[PDB]
């Protein structure tokens, strides 16, 4: 207990390390990056059955080609989203084109550095498409570091989720396979039974952009998963 930007004897930033702890307590978020698209799924985790589930916005659009899932202290994510949107629209204003997914992420991570009194208590999975590098997935920590992943999971269930993502991911996953896998791996790590109300799916395709799946299209895949896993 001495300062905010203080170094530990092991050369880590105290507050940055403790923010990482907050993220571990967050609802689970999973992302899978394929050649047909990128999928983002989350665990709603209502703290009570009276909470209206569809008012839980843990997947948010940034630009038509860029979406993002969060985990941790989700309130801290507000000004990152806002800043992300401004960066993407501003880029289109100055350059008459879509911002690169890596540039958008780098910008959010720039914001992350500006500690503002404390680091953010939230990590973000940023997914989208651009002409140059195709379908991409990014993990953005409140350290200002970001990482590209073929697949990634963040939140309380992430240790087991990552392990499962390690077995199941290969460079030829179809989008529909990838959707099923996100749903499956969420079902395993969620402290509740996965249905269309406590889990949300979304993806970005080159052609259709970023779409949040409504509860009806999700429920179908849940039903399709229960069956794909009955026969086997």
């Amino acid at each position: 207990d001495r300062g905010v930007s203080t170094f530990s004897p092991e050369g880590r930033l105290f507050q940055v390390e403790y923010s990482l702890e907050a993220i571990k307590l967050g609802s689970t978020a999973i992302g899978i990056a394929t050649k047909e698209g990128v999928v983002l799924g989350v665990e709603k985790r209502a703290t009570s059955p009276l909470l209206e589930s569809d008012s839980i916005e843990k997947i948010v659009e940034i630009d038509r080609h860029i979406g993002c899932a969060m985990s941790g202290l989700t309130a801290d994510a507000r000004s990152m989203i806002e800043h992300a949107r401004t960066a993407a629209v501003t880029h289109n204003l100055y350059y008459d084109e879509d911002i690169n997914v890596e540039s958008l992420t780098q910008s959010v991570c720039d914001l992350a550095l500006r500690f503002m009194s404390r680091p953010f208590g939230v990590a973000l999975l940023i997914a989208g498409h651009d002409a140059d590098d195709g379908y991409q997935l990014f993990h953005a920590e409140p350290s200002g570091t970001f990482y590209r992943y073929n697949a990634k999971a963040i939140g309380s269930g992430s240790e087991g989720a990552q392990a499962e993502l390690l077995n199941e991911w290969h460079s030829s996953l179809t989008l529909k396979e990838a959707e099923l896998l996100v749903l499956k791996i969420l079902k395993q790590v969620m402290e509740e039974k996965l249905d269309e109300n406590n889990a949300q799916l979304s993806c970005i395709t080159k052609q259709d952009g970023f779409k949040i799946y409504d509860n009806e299209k999700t429920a179908e895949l849940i039903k399709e998963l229960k069956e794909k896993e009955a026969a086997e």
Binding site: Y18, L20, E21, L50, A75, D76, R78, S117
Partner: protein, 241 residues
Amino acid sequence: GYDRALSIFSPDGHIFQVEYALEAVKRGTCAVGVKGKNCVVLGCERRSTLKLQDTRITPSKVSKIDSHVVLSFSGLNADSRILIEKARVEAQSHRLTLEDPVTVEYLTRYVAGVQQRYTQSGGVRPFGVSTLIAGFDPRDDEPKLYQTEPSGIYSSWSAQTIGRNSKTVREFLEKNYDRKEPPATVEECVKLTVRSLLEVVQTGAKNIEITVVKPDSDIVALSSEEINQYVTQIEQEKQEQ
């Protein structure tokens, strides 16, 4: 230039100032809100340190933000005046620039936003306040109820309660409130509200206060007597062996 960081992380990943802000909320008098088919009802309680109070002039717990939205709070009363002022200023500012009154969701997002900012700025403490915000969007009939807390998280609720002994009343509401059937009458929606408050308050005398919001800026407070008509109907009739 005082910017000494007060809201910081602890080794287990908790922001203790935000946490103790929640403690101040749970210390505050209870507030509840429940939404009907064509309405939303907000209910509060009063304390008993002294009862030589003048009730005409003492700040009521339900505040009008615009003519179609209201805010009630649990926690530090002084803190809530500040959140209400800003919400009032924003409501006028949204009308001025967008030529429409706020949606309940938008006003909620704004207030939650202000709370959040206070969790990460130097030399400020979080708000010792959690809020229930209720009303109807302009030209819309579907009722709206939202809750914010000192962290800046916000969400919508079929029904919700906050403050001292809210654990108890959330218990009651969870068994009684049917997702299938919301209290279709204004009347029976005020019923579920007074019942839920009776567990905590004692006699629903000079302590329980109620406010009803209908669409198109229709907002009526109740009187002691019209409350007493609900206190009476449940005690005697739901006393049956």
